[PDB]
Amino acid sequence: EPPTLALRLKPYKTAIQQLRSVIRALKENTTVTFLPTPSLILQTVRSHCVSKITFNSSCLYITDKSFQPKTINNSTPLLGNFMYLTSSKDLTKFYVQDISDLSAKISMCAPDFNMEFSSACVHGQDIVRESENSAVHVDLDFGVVADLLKWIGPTGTVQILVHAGPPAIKFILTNGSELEFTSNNRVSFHGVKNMRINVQLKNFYQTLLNCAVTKLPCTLRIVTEHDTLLYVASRNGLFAVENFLTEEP
């Protein structure tokens, strides 16, 4: 039996339903990485934004740890959106086998059906990762995230201003409207530094929506180790949603 990575259906099904919106909107700029951890990472790449969804160990089962990491594009030659297909309510078994170093053999089952598909592997795919520490790090209650979404929602940029002492975070719109959160029971400020970044409103809003699916707190960090990036993430017991946005001039 070749190294096999299987999905534990109960939690995996719960997970994709919460991510339905995200999964359904995936296009051609997304990769799926299967790791022997076990782990499943979906990474969507845009010019100034990288979105990543990581399913944790509780959603997977791995037999043999010699399973070589496998990466494929989500846009499959005849089936189209791969992850969307795994969201089918009929799915009863889903597993990936490491037969060749060149492809991933994916098997799926449903009541009186079974299917197998071999997808060529992508080599050297770069996966964006959250930095150890950073210039700014704030945690926000889900309710704060909801406030931000409500305030922004139905091009342009949004300025994110962070203040030292007392700690504070402000979101500024081009029209001179500002939403601020001071240190209190709804937001925890770990690392703070006086700085202001500018990000694309659309990607920022989209990032907040992606994180909101957890209905749990979010983390916002501004990293300056290299080029300035804004990091917005949230997680639950099944997956973690992470987004990295670059600055707009």
Partner: peptide, 20 residues
Amino acid sequence: RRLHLEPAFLPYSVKAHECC
């Protein structure tokens, strides 16, 4: 290497094989 990242993201990335 399928999806290329803009230069700004490269230093914050690692190869899928050295991932967790």
